[PDB]
Design a protein around this ligand. Sequence first.
Ligand SMILES: CCCCCCCCCCCCCC(=O)O
Ligand SMILES: CCCCCCCCCCCCCC(=O)O
Ligand SMILES: CCCCCCCCCCCCCC(=O)O
Ligand SMILES: CCCCCCCC(=O)O
Ligand SMILES: CCCCCCCC(=O)O
Ligand SMILES: CCCCCCCC(=O)O
Length: 585
Amino acid sequence: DAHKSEVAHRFKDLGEENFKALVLIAFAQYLQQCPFEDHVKLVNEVTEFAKTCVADESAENCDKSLHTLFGDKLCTVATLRETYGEMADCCAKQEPERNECFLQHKDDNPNLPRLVRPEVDVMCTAFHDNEETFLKKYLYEIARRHPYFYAPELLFFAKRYKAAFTECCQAADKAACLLPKLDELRDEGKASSAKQRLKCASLQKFGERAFKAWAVARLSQRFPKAEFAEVSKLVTDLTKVHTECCHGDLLECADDRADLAKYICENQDSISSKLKECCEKPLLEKSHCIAEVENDEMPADLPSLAADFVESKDVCKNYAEAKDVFLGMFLYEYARRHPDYSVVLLLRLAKTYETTLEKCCAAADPHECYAKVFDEFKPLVEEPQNLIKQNCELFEQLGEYKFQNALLVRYTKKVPQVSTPTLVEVSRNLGKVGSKCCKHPEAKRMPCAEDYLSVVLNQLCVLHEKTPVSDRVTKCCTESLVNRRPCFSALEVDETYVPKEFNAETFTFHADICTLSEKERQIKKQTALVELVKHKPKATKEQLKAVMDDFAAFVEKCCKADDKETCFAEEGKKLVAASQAALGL
Ligand SMILES: CCCCCCCCCCCCCC(=O)O
Ligand SMILES: CCCCCCCCCCCCCC(=O)O
Ligand SMILES: CCCCCCCCCCCCCC(=O)O
Ligand SMILES: CCCCCCCC(=O)O
Ligand SMILES: CCCCCCCC(=O)O
Ligand SMILES: CCCCCCCC(=O)O
């Protein structure tokens, strides 16, 4: 932005620590197989080189582009071909195709084992020793396992990791403090990874007019006082930002985000008052602050839509000759008044409005034909309101764990053809959504649950379609964006299903069970619960509790037994007995 040097410019804004944090990510996400130490020297080189340009913006390569700089360094990797090989012919190519070629050679599934969580004591100790290397090690390990993960986001997760350690590493029961939180942040990070991929998948299969419509609604809720032209300006920026972030171009994604963080804070008066504190913080501190900001208050000087979008005579004209803008306004208007709504409900209403006009416009008397359309919103709006109210009541009268159990039983009776894992996972995650969002007051529940919800349905939509088993689920999964959830809400109990033969599955076991945590054990109860319901699709709570206890007892006993694999074998057969009867079969 009129800065001879772009790197030293980025270095001033970011800062030394953030700058090293971000390079480490970038390189880790291609150099997944290179050693950590080789990375540290790399960041040290890049960081030294950038300070040379900080001092003299007219030094060397300090005029060159970041893409060139980056790609040059990555070609310097001399062990590349041995470890990577194909990513080396990316270097023969010149820019811009060179960076395009690297981009293509990122591995979505690095061939790397999962992380072995150490013990609280040793981790907190290694954290204390050298905090800075600890969080670099973490960044390295995560980045290299999540290559298309957005680097700023990851870095903010990093700082949150730092903060939870700083807290629990100076605490008494440490374990009974950290592990609860490590489980929270792990879940938030998969939430974020999966949300990214969803938006990028949505952009691709739903164009961009769609993503733009998403943006119109989201911003207008956050910035109800923004004048529509500002909103539109941001929609366009954000559109590009997201377009690049999805492409997998860190540099562009990261630097365009900083630009947009600049503009927004600069025009705080027109956009929102709530940017007060944000716009003060450092570069990638405000940045997340803006995105984390709370909704400004709407005006009270606010009429109904009706006059402009239902009553007005030159409406059909307006649609036809300028469709995008007219509906654009609808969206902004509808949204700015309704921050309690989820985005895709707002899209659903807009699409309902669209679908009317397309019809009523090229018709006899358009007015009386479309003049009833806001009454068609009422149920589209209430259906989800009821769902969340009623699920949250249930989540509240039960706890997380017993709420998962409810949904397990419910959803297995709906779609018993689905794999047991998919049901367990889906019901668990839905419960977590109750943990995260039910605590909030109604006006913030839909927005809060939406991100999570849409990612979870996706996860089942993905899994299922890898090996389809249910035509009712297929339909919902290949229904449109806006019809996806209602389809899922309309699933009814499956009658035709023929229960399973009362045999093994989750009835053959070993003493590998006696040695498991609450978490691993409740996933096994949950697994065992779903199976039961498959064996008896009309079993009951009082029937299931009874079998579940006989299960629980079979564990307590065989686990507290002198021999195990003999006990589990003898009593193994005799539990299918005391279950088959109990269920009423
Ligand atoms: C309490 C767990 C999450 C909610 C479970 C209800 C499943 C139906 C989804 C309808 C909710 C619409 C609003 C939203 O989630 O954004
Ligand atoms: C297990 C397949 C059926 C539903 C799976 C996802 C549930 C959440 C979104 C749809 C809401 C369903 C309403 C309900 O729970 O009764
Ligand atoms: C195959 C058995 C399913 C039950 C879940 C795994 C074992 C945990 C049972 C819950 C009670 C704890 C055991 C005990 O009381 O000793
Ligand atoms: C994340 C923006 C900071 C600069 C990263 C690329 C530097 C380089 O490889 O020359
Ligand atoms: C894209 C489906 C939603 C209705 C049209 C509004 C789109 C826009 O504001 O760009
Ligand atoms: C954040 C708690 C978990 C709910 C979000 C969905 C997780 C996933 O599908 O990976």
